[PDB]
Amino acid sequence: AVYYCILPKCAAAANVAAHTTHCFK
Ligand SMILES: [Zn+2]
What is the whole-number distance in angstroms between the Cα of residue 21 and the centre of ligand 1? Predict the structure, then answer.
């Protein structure tokens, strides 16, 4: 998910469905 995202500027709207694409949790 996004909660386990260690990136400051990953998602624009804090979206996960679009973030997970690059982030492997
Ligand atoms: Zn991320």
Answer: 8
The helices-and-strands tally (H runs, E runs) of the chain is: 0, 0
Centre of ligand 1 from the C-alpha of residue 12, in Å: 10
Q: Find the length of the chain.
A: 25
- Six token digits for residue 8: 């400051």
Tokens of 6: 């260690």
Contact 2/16 with Cβ under 8 angstroms?
yes
**Where exactly are the structural domains of the chain?**
1-25
Q: Ligand 1 centre from 16 Cα, in Å?
A: 7
